């Protein structure tokens, strides 16, 4: 088989300036009939892959100039003349010269972008969720940066560290920031013997703690 | 416009069989061939197979040659792959795509869990804030995965984070956030809709000002 190398998993690059992906392959791509057969997509969390590229150097419709592809018949590079944040995701080549067709293993852009404090929102249980027994602490830390964040869960003031689960999501396609949910999940009994919640974040934008709290009683 | 549309989940028992389905729409579907690539989870794409549909003319990549079985049929515009005897290595996402001269289109692909653990539809509830604004929706307890979470039926879609599902006793949990201007609600209606596939349920659900 054509072996397709993208020997980067990753690159990083600071918004507004140019980057080059590279992509090998183990035989030339130039076909008998004058073309080089290589495609460049790009691929967004939870999306199908994005045509860039065909023909190893024609932009597709609707993508922007400042795409552009190039190669020999073994060596080829995508430029992205200026980084903007919607260019965040998974870039793959393909060749399609011989069967089986075969792809490199993709290349994430990282966006290195500027500090940037989160929005801190705490969201009591539903009261639909009461009536089934269980209750939900929700925390939500949007649009951060860098990635690394602690939070803490407080109850009437002590710390609570069993019961919760995080998840971040990938950079925003707009901003290139992070966020993340805090859930804390406990029986309705547990919820209803304590009265103050707390959820407690540290970022590198403070030297102090990004608090927000609720009391359950207080509607 | 050319499309191929493909079921979001299939959940497969260990060792069962599964066929896979794309429909096709807006061009002679005899005429151009269709490809399929799977995707590991957090992994790469790679390529499975291509089949012409006037013909039912067939490619395979070796390494699936006692996996993958490639059809058509031609009377309802629909390519066919079925997976045989499946592993926890063949739960991916599967995409059919198509080729039209140099320019593919793809479909949005679906998601093959291998297991014995029974569908199970989320819970979902809608968050309020404590007594801009942000405004939560929770989805609890599913599986498989996906879901597919909205607000408005998709028509709010700036200031939405929709965060990655967790897993714990077999059981999913996903939120989302919403974030709008103070003015918009609750003056204006904000609801948080959530289809599961895999149990064939929508279920929406208008955020409330929280009462005493």
């Known amino acids: 088989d054509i072996v397709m190398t993208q020997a980067a998993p990753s690159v990083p690059v600071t918004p507004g300036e140019s980057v080059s992906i590279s992509c090998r392959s183990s035989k030339s791509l130039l076909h008998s009939n004058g073309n080089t057969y290589l495609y460049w997509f790009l691929q967004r969390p939870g999306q199908s892959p994005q045509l860039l590229i065909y023909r190893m150097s024609n932009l597709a419709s609707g993508v922007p100039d400042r795409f552009s592809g190039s190669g020999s018949g073994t060596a080829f590079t995508l430029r992205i003349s200026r980084v903007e944040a919607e260019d965040v995701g998974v870039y793959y080549c393909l060749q399609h010269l011989e069967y089986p067709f075969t792809f490199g293993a993709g290349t994430k852009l990282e966006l290195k972008r500027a500090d940037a404090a989160p929005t801190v929102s705490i969201f009591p249980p539903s009261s639909e969720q009461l009536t089934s027994g269980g209750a939900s602490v929700v925390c939500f830390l949007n649009n951060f940066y860098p990635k690394d964040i602690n939070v803490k869960w407080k109850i009437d003031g002590s710390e609570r560290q069993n019961g919760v689960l995080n998840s971040w999501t990938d950079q925003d396609s707009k901003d290139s920031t992070y966020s993340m949910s805090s859930t804390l999940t406990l029986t309705k009994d547990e919820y209803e013997r304590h009265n103050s919640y707390t959820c407690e974040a540290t970022h590198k934008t403070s030297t102090s703690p990004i608090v927000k709290s609720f009391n359950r009683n207080e509607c | 416009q050319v499309q191929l549309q493909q079921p979001g989940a299939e959940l497969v028992k260990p060792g069962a069989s599964v066929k896979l389905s794309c429909k096709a729409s807006?061009?002679?579907?005899?005429?151009?061939?269709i490809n399929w690539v799977k995707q590991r989870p957090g992994q790469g794409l790679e390529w499975i197979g291509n089949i012409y549909p006037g013909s039912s003319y067939t490619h395979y990549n070796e390494k699936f040659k006692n996996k993958a079985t490639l059809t058509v049929d031609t009377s309802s515009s629909t390519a066919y792959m079925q997976l045989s005897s499946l592993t926890s290595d063949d739960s991916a996402v599967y995409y059919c795509?198509?080729?039209?001269?140099?320019?593919?289109?793809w479909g949005q692909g679906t998601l093959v869990t291998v297991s014995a653990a029974k569908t199970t539809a989320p819970s979902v509830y809608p968050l309020a804030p404590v007594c801009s604004v942000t405004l939560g929706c929770l989805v609890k307890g599913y599986f498989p995965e996906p879901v597919t979470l909205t607000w408005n039926s998709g028509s709010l879609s700036s200031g939405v984070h929709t965060f990655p599902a967790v897993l714990q006793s077999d059981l999913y949990t996903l939120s989302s956030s919403v974030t709008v201007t103070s003015s918009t609600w609750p003056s204006q209606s904000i609801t948080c809709n959530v289809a599961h596939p895999a149990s064939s349920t929508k279920v929406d659900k208008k955020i409330e000002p929280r009462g005493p």
């Open positions: 807006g061009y002679t579907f005899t005429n151009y061939w």
């Open positions: 795509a198509n080729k039209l001269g140099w320019f593919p289109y």
